[PDB]
Structures are given as structure tokens and as C-alpha cells.
Amino acid sequence: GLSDGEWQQVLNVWGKVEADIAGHGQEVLIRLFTGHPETLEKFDKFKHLKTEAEMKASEDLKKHGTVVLTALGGILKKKGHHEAELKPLAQSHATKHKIPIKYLEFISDAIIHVLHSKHPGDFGADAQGAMTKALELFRNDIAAKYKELGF
Ligand SMILES: O=N[O-]
């Protein structure tokens, strides 16, 4: 889906995330939950987080942030050749977690937002184009498996 140039940008940007995977993960999930509270309802382990202060204080939210972004980082490093890596996540998110694809669009928007917020002026126009394309590629492939499943 992406040029070599663009994957190079993606993985350069991802270097920022890897310097603090838990901090980026936490902010991504906070941005997701605060912006779209219905998403929090999908996590019976975060459902108790009534306030953003409680979210910020939750070490388990940070932990999940690390899981989510580690899984994404793994995927991104495959530069689109990610069928094996994406399959179980499509299946778990459609069949077990019941996550509509729209919420994957929300978390993609949250990643772009967090990158800007944590790295203002350091996440260039090209970098945003490339990262956006990578996230859409990820979403588009998840969506194909959701359609296979009828979800
Ligand atoms: O936070 N997505 O598992």
C-alpha cells in the first residue's frame, strides 16, 4: 500500500513511540476513551475508570497501552506483509471483543493526535501522510477479515 519512502517514514516515526511505549500507549488509550466513551465500555477492566485522573493513575491502562502498541509496532515492521500478525487480532476483535471497525478508526486518529501532542513540530507533513496510510492499511486489512466473518 505504501512506498519504500513512506515505510521508512513510518518506522522513523515509530522510533519516537519505542522510546516510550508505555507513555505513548497510555496517552493513546486516554485519548480514545475520553474522546469516545463508548469505547471504554468495551473493556470491562477499564470500565471503572470514571475520570481521566483515574485513567492516568491506572498502571494497568499503561500496561494495556504497551501491549496494544507493541502489537502494532510488530505489524508496522512487517511493512504490509502482516497477514499472520493481523489474523488473530481481527479474529479476537471481531469475535471476542466485538470491536466495530469504526473504533479502529478512532484509535488510528488517537495515535496521530498523540504523536502531534508529544512531538509538536517534530511530526512532519510527510510523516503524518505515511503513518496515516500505514494505519489505514492496517484497518483495511482488519476490515477485510471482519467482512469474511460477517462482523
Ligand atoms: O486497546 N486496544 O486493545
Q: Is 32 exposed, middle or buried (0-12, 13-18, 19+ CB in 10 A)?
A: buried
Residue 24 known to bind ligand:
no
Q: CA-to-CA distance for 41 and 89, rounded, in angstroms? A: 19
Residue 64 known to bind ligand:
yes
Position 3, amino acid:
S
What's the chain's Rg over C-alpha atoms? 15
Joined together, the cell numbers standing for residue 102 give 469504526
> How far from 138 is each of 34, 49, 61, 70, 86, CA to CA, in Å?
23, 28, 23, 14, 8
Q: CA-to-CA distance for 123 and 6, rounded, in angstroms? A: 14
Q: Could you identify the atom of ligand 1 that is nearest to the CA of residue 93?
A: 3
Say which CATH number the domain at 7 has.
1.10.490.10
Which residues have a Cβ under 8 Å from the Cβ of 63 and sit 6 or more positions away?
Answer: 22
- C-alpha 28 to ligand 1 mean position (Å): 9
**73 alpha carbon, distance to own chain's centre:** 9
Q: How was this structure determined?
A: X-ray
Find the residues whose C-beta lies inside 6 A of ligand 1. 29, 64, 68
**Atom 2 (ligand 1): residue with closest C-alpha?**
68
22 near 132, Cβ under 8 Å?
Answer: no
Model resolution, angstroms: 1.7
Q: CA-to-CA distance for 84 and 68, rounded, in angstroms? A: 16
Number of domains in the chain: 1
Q: CA-to-CA distance for 146 and 151, rounded, in angstroms? A: 5
**Atom 1 (ligand 1): residue with closest C-alpha?**
68
Owning domain of residue 24: 1-151
